[PDB]
């Protein structure tokens with residue numbers, strides 16, 4: 244299933260050789276945070292381009308659900324991240340690594356995937372007074388060629404649009420490679 248997305252990545256994410264699909268990957272993750280803001284529950288989304296060839300998206304909403312199905316022993320989070328506006332499970336499938344961190348009901352929950360395959364079960368990693376969801380992913384270099392790094396202006400342009408299409412939401416873009424920071428919010 245995740246094998247199908249890796250065999251024909253272009254079908255799912257867009258062109259893999261000119262940057263298009265690489266940036267679509269971020270937008271897929273952002274769209275999920277935007278939907279939490281449209282549901283009334285998220286006021287700030289933070290997109291950070293890291294210096295290790297990863298992007299993180301962090302929202303301040305309710306947190307992705309963390310419950311376990313008792314008979315299956317798989318968390319809701321894992322179901323969201325592994326099963327097939329193409330969905331975040333596609334992003335996971337085309338990421339050499341993906342880290343999900345969820346702050347919810349006083350606890351921090353974390354899980355790591357490699358090419359979509361979870362490495363261990365969802366685990367509690369501490370306590371928190373805050374709620375929200377953070378996804379950080381390192382795109383697969385077996386999939387993406389030529390443009391394998393994130394480009395601030397492609398994200399900036401798009402995140403500005405989202406902020407004005409979803410008035411009230413605050414969207415912050417941060418680049419760790421040079422300290423560039425933008426804040427998009429409209430009234």
Ligand SMILES: CCNC(=O)Nc1cc(Nc2cccc(C)c2)c(C(=O)Nc2cccc(C)c2)cn1
Nearest residue numbers: 272275276279300304305306307308323376377378
């Ligand atoms: C960085 C990317 N941001 C997010 O993924 N934000 C996010 C997503 C959420 N749910 C969600 C995600 C993907 C697929 C589906 C169906 C739901 C939810 C969500 O549905 N939380 C929620 C909402 C109602 C009840 C419970 C238990 C949990 C909250 N935030």
